[PDB]
Design a protein around this ligand. Sequence first.
Ligand SMILES: OC[C@H]1O[C@@H](O)[C@H](O)[C@@H](O)[C@@H]1O
Length: 450
Amino acid sequence: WGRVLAILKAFEEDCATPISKLRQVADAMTVEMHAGLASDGGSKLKMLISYVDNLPSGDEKGLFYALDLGGTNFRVMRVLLGGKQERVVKQEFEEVSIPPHLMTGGSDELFNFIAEALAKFVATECEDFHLPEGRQRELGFTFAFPVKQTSLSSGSLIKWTKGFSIEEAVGQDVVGALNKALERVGLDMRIAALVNDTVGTLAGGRYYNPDVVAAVILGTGTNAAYVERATAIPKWHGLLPKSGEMVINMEWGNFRSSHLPLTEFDHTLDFESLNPGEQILEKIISGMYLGEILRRVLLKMAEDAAFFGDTVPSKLRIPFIIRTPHMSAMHNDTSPDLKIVGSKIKDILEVPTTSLKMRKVVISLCNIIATRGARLSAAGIYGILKKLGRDQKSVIAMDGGLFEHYTQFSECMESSLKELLGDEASGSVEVTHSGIGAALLAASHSLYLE
Ligand SMILES: OC[C@H]1O[C@@H](O)[C@H](O)[C@@H](O)[C@@H]1O
């Protein structure tokens, strides 16, 4: 290593996000927010209206179910809410990994999967979760994909992201689909709310902190939601909210700008993806893609600089063979001779023996990729704050694996938001962590009292 350094040098330079560039990115973001709000097709930012005009206050009460469909995991939960003082009295939930074949199969089978798991969960209901009366179960549905919302409890799928590809479902109503799946298992359920995962995170965060104004998800995918003034949404007039507010789902994963520090590797990832040209910003930020970027750099060094000897390892040529959790562990390796980077490369790529020089390169690459994504996340948040005129206490409710379980990532993001804000503003913005959100929104729309 060995001209491996030349590629390393270039990639580091092409990925650079000095503050000037973050300011340019934030400014481009704020511009797209205005464009996206002014016209349905005016921006890469769809700026979807959620039909949430009232956020949780804390006085919600009753029994509520919630469904949560993400990119890789599905969740079923129920909660007892006891008002202002009691809040969440009791909570139960089960999590199921989604069988990969369901991601690209048919619509019915995806929704059967959801309905059948929910039915099994419902059957375990007992004690304090016993359905009172004389009543019907009420459900909140978190659905982590772009939706053209028609009401709080309805909307059609716009497109898939995160490796999903069920074309049958594009344009079809998500709640109607679930409703038909619920009919097939003979489960009676009132869907009171359908929300994007950013929206639920925002509702859940605002429930615990009145000053929450936005939510950002940095997990398998990436996205953000925020509370916008109704008058600042010229494209939409299908309701006159008394609050004067409306929560927006930005779908910022799809953001693109010439100021984005893209490399040949991000280009090849994109061109070979399931959704080429879409989710450009998501593909350099989210946990789905970070490892895959790493994989493409290492493959480049393997075939042109003999990083792994004369023969390129066969497992390096397989897409998504390197996951982001592999990256973060290697990134955390503070040890001489870098034990962890060594055992991760061996375990995952089936390469015996790596010099110190090779694992120093790998840990450097990990840092370059994680830092870019984190700093770009900060520029995103700063873009939202400028839209809000907030560039006075603002809280950003965060969720997702990258922010919760990747120390380097979440710390770099907070540092760079701080630098972006500056002495004046920084000291009035707080980034904090904690589904329940969708249930809280169902709770405001319950046909029952307590
Ligand atoms: O889960 C985080 C985000 O992932 C993106 O790929 C989806 O399009 C969004 O709807 C979601 O909010």
